[PDB]
Amino acid sequence: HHWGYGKHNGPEHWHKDFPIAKGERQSPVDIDTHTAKYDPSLKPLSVSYDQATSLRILNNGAAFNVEFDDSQDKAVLKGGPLDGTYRLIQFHFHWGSLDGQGSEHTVDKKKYAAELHLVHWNTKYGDFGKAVQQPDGLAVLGIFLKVGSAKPGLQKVVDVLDSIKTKGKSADFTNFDPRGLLPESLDYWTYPGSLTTPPLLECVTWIVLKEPISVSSEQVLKFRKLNFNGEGEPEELMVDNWRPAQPLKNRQIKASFK
């Protein structure tokens, strides 16, 4: 009886196995744009993904992850509210059963159809495992998805989902360029938070982009065909794999723009 997104093992139940769920810096949160503080000292984000090397795509029962080779500084994030270099290890999405919900973070209570999370770890800690033991060990770049025009750069991902329909399945996924998933502007909001799935560790510096990317109804529909279940068990569609907004507590959201 492990964690999930169902009525008996959903987000409201996570605190029993992961007490940190009721912690001081949990994510996601609602971004109140009028209370966010413009910080002139925040430097522009530096995204260097030209040398990225994707390796595999897999269904882990909660979402699907596209993993990258992080043995060298091939795809890194620098600048912004960050000190040092952060290496990209994987990206995944959270989505809903309908176009009106799916994102984890909200903007003035508005929910988007999905949210993309590019996960990076601080290279000064040597590896991901060590990074998750530090308060500044991870940096997650969050991008909202709205339904409208199709995103060409996302198609290669949607076309392989059929091969990893059930939990545990994985497939080679090389030469995928994540630059095709980025919006025009890099304006962002940032705040200290946590991973949005167990273990819910509080080691994340969140960088949420203000500009969402558009994807087509057909593309998001393919996400909804995945299964939470594995093997040959009762089919349970992988939808609404998002966590509700958490208390901001003693935290301030900063904006790179005004």
Residues within the interface to Hg ion (CB under 5 A): 201, 203
Nearest approach, Cβ of residue 18 and Zn ion (Å): 15
Closer residue to Zn ion in complex, CB, 25/117: 117
Rounded Cα gap, residues 10 and 79, in angstroms: 36
**Judged by CB, which is closer to Zn ion: 149, or 196?**
196
The region that residue 41 occupies, defined by phi over 0 for left and psi between -120 and 50 for alpha, beta otherwise, is alpha
Toward Zn ion, which CB reaches closer, 144 or 235? Answer: 144
**In whole angstroms, how close is the CB of 132 to Hg ion at the nearest point?**
6
CB of 101 to Zn ion, least distance (A): 15
Do residues 108 and 175 touch, judged by C-beta distance below 8 A?
no
Q: Which is nearer to Hg ion, 201 or 255 (CB)?
A: 201
117 binds Zn ion (CB under 5 A): yes
Please choose which of Hg ion, Zn ion, none residue 117 contacts, taking the beta carbon within 5 to 8 angstroms, the exact cut-off set by kind. Answer: Zn ion
Pick 194 or 196: Cβ nearer Zn ion: 196
**Helices marked H in 146-192:** 155-158
| 203 contact, one of Hg ion, Zn ion, none, CB 5-8 Å limit per kind | Hg ion
Should residue 210 be labelled a site residue for Zn ion when binding is judged by CB under 5 A?
no
Residue 106's binding partner among Zn ion, Hg ion, none (Cβ under 5 to 8 angstroms by kind) is none
Q: Which amino acid is at 215?
A: V
For CA atoms 209, 210, 211, 216, the dihedral sign is positive
Residue at 191: amino acid letter: Y
Looking at residues 42 to 81 of the shown chain, list those that interact with Zn ion (rule: CB under 5 A): none
CA distances, 10 to each of 6, 7, 16, 17 (Å): 5, 6, 11, 12
Chain centroid to Cα 165, Å, comes to: 20
The partner in contact with residue 239, picked from Hg ion, Zn ion, none with C-beta cut-offs of 5 to 8 angstroms by kind, is none
Report the C-alpha gap between 108 and 148 in whole angstroms. Answer: 21
Number of residues engaging Zn ion in binding (CB under 5 A) = 2
Residues in the chain, how many? 258
Task: Map residue 123 onto helix, strand or coil.
Answer: helix
Binders in 190-209 for Zn ion, by CB under 5 A = 196
Contact between 120 and Zn ion (CB under 5 A)?
no
Cα–Cα dist 256/81, whole Å? 9
| Chain residues in the site for Zn ion (CB under 5 A) | 117, 196
